[model samples]
Target chain A: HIGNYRLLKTIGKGNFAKVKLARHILTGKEVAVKIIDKTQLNSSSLQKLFREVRIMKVLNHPNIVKLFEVIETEKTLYLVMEYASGGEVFDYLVAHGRMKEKEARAKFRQIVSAVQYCHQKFIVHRDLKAENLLLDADMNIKIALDAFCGAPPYAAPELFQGKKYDGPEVDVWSLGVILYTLVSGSLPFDGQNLKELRERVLRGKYRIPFYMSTDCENLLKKFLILNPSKRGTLEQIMKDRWMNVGHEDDELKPYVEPLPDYKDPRRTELMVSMGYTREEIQDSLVGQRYNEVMATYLLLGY
Target chain B: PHIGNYRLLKTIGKGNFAKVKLARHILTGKEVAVKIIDKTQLNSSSLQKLFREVRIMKVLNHPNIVKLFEVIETEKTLYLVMEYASGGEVFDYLVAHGRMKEKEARAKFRQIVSAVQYCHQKFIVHRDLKAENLLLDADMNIKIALDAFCGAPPYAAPELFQGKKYDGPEVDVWSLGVILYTLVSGSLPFDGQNLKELRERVLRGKYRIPFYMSTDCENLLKKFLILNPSKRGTLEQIMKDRWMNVGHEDDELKPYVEPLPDYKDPRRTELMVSMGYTREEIQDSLVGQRYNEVMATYLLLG
Candidate 1:
């Protein structure tokens, strides 16, 4: 239980952590709670967890999964976040087997929007894959944008060649993998092992299955370029005709600065009744304690 | 020298039947609050209530509610290990700082209401709802401290005094109103020099509405402090009140749409078997839902 959320059944699991569906006890709000076992994490692994939280807290966008609360106990760390009803994009692809051009373009636009937002805030989702991209009930993107692990299939060619490069380009390469899979219903490059996968990735070898749109193929070529510098920038990708399709030119709104002493009377009243003092709350907000007081404020505000 | 693997630090709190001690996990070095109950001193009713409390706690998982980690029982003693709150009682803070600002009060109150709503949903009612029972943790969030068997008179509903068949949720709602009144006015709604006077005041259903209080808040308090139990404001009504809706978007409660089916990788299964685990053994552990080392390994691999 992190704050008012009761951890429910284990929905997804990984090497060092697991995801559970949680319900907020008060508001009946359902959240995906990620519980990381601290005992299993080394110093570097722990550092990554903190970094993820720090970045996730700053990212505010429609397509990104909102990180609501973080609770650290002696044995474990819990991340209570927005629950995506539509599940992973990978699963949707596997179950349904590819998407129509219209559908793919809409979903891809959302993913790009989220990535664009992250980059603008100087945030980089180093690991971007179909598995990390979640969909809400509306089939809108809710990017589960951060994690330390990398899938070989979605990894950039430069990573396999041990080439040190800037981050955003790798994300672009992964997006190329996601785009190909979304339309073709198969990975761009697949191998029985890492050896074969690395060779294929380095050569940038992949097939276009069935008939493909020239515009989408051109966009794919731009994203999947072997040289990181040759890859399409997010700015150029967003401006691509295929990325736009029938949709109008829509730009992300500018990030707004929050009021210094922003007040939510409803939230404040509820918290005060729960036993917090005005001074204690002020100190928490002003000092940026990021404790229960701050968490309550953010969550209630969300 | 210690209970299980925890080293007792110091006594932090005490009740009629149990004393809470701050303890540290030996290996993890994480602090936890352990409520130690002497079994020998308990009457039959108290013993039964103690067991019930344990059962209820095991089922509850919420951030705003104090978490019960483990129960250790010996021949003469019972230890209830829980999440330690470094910040003290909300009651003490209120006393020290006087009434809260509207924002602080609403925020805290919302948390309390949320916890209460969760309890109600689980068919549990905190008969005791008072500022003292609300604890502030290191996170600056309110953790509802459960001591329901012994209700505080100042926060008690009229039905508790006038013997009648009263719904538990309604009584809790009444107590919630009393808490709200105290939070906003820095004083209890009904109080007396003695038990008789206190009972009379509560039964009379009269309390001063502070002039400074918002009309919405005043109306909610009046609605809750009703003579007839059925006429008392409900958790639903309270949540929907204009006071509660101030700067509130009721979009938090999302329906629990089913998540994606668990990803099954044949590669991981083969890898597990290669490590010497039999296919049948792995299948049995996965199917049984034992959550043991075997299951853990399977989930970790997945």
Candidate 2:
């Protein structure tokens, strides 16, 4: 056990950090713990980890993984976040080799929705490759990780040109790459090396699979606009002909307001029953304090 | 008191989880500010703020922004070794020195805006930008410091007190407006004994520009102190303002480079190599994105 969490087993690994499956001692809920050894960290790595935490805390979306708690000791730092037990979306793609149009569209919609939410909050994922996309036990897409790890194949043309960006336009380009891979079960652009790939990306030339529909191809072209300024906004993507295949509901839900503790009697009462006072919970929520009471309140579900 | 190779001389400031001290680097005998953060004292929110401050500080490479020289994490504390500003805070300066002349205000405000422009260019928002957070070096130049989502109410934007999601840069512009107003007038534009009164004044956007304030300066103030965030003066607009450009010189500004050039100073790199770290090792750690002794040493020299 590390602090208040019970260590389970390692889930993933990096050079100076490790992702471990852990359980919250009080809540009994499974959480993913990212452990980083202080001794091995450099300024860039530290910035990346801290940026991820900062960005994740402000974000509240079902399609995105949630950051719960951050614990730092003398030698290590721990990021306690929601666990998505199903592993990487890349692994699933490798096993299936390709996805059906209906399944792919559903996944793509969720991905776009999450990215749109990030854009609304002025956050650029920066890295949007298949490797960084994770799946939950319910087989739902959870957009995870942003460390400027622009995978060569998924990178936009402007990235290679080394130009200034307002952020969203490049992400639109990556969406095209992700969408292409989802439907075709293969990357749209590739070369023997990064140099060759850059050449192809710069040329903005890629073959659309024969089976791809006209509307899908049209949307794809819009996303892969050579000039970032011409790249369609996520709003445009959400309203695309192919993207709204089965439009029973809106592609993205309206932003939900965080319910105040005073008004949330049901939630507050639950916490009160667990040996806490309503005033205590209300004060904690009002002040936005992050203690066991706040953790217990969140763990009680929403 | 000592942590790592720095010896703490005296406490400079204290926050909830951070206690900043004036320190001397043992190896070089250079004065530095070491912000010691006790790991045990951090709540979840404070931890997130600490991480955010560190992350933002790392990317920000400007003479007007306080530099983070090194970070030393021990078993019980996290020490943020930073460029020592012997001149203390702009708040303290105002308290002791009173209001500045238009010429002096213009110079300091320009530097502050330059730093703010650099931050916004990198898509970072200093949610807390006030006189207290703005530091002055021994040379009496502005060095933007202290970062968090929350700040003094008088500097807060109307949207911040409204309990709604607000744009990042817009809020910062509001705080910058307050700082500029404070710098010139020797008092906050909107302030009250109670938060309610402060909130009302901020939301109403009825702050007065002093009679002696220049027409251009007053115009800039009007542009910044708008009730609607959309109407607020952007960093770009502020940079191009008539008052801001009165004596603007481009040579003094640094290029907005990404992944800031690792070997900008050839002598610094040579110094690192001479200190027994192989050239390959120094380059590898930097490119590999590790925050190790090598990186700390290299940055300290810079």
lDDT string for model 2 (B121-169, tens) is 8899876566657888888998877222123557767765443445578
lDDT of 1 by residue, B166-277 (tens): 4568888888888888788888888643333456678888887778888888887876788788887668666777776576775442212333434345776677678677
| Model 1 CA lDDT for position A115 | 83
* Maximum-TM-score candidate: 2
Q: What proportion of the true contacts does each candidate reproduce? A: 0.00, 0.00
Alpha-carbon interface RMSD for all candidates, in angstroms: 31.7, 20.3
Error of 1 at B147 (Å): 53
For model 2 the local lDDT of residue B43 reads 51
Name the docking class for model 2: incorrect
Candidate 2 has an interface RMSD (Å) of 20.3
Mark the regions of model 1 whose C-alpha exceeds 4 Å error after superposition.
A1-3, A145-150, A249-261, A269-289, B1-302
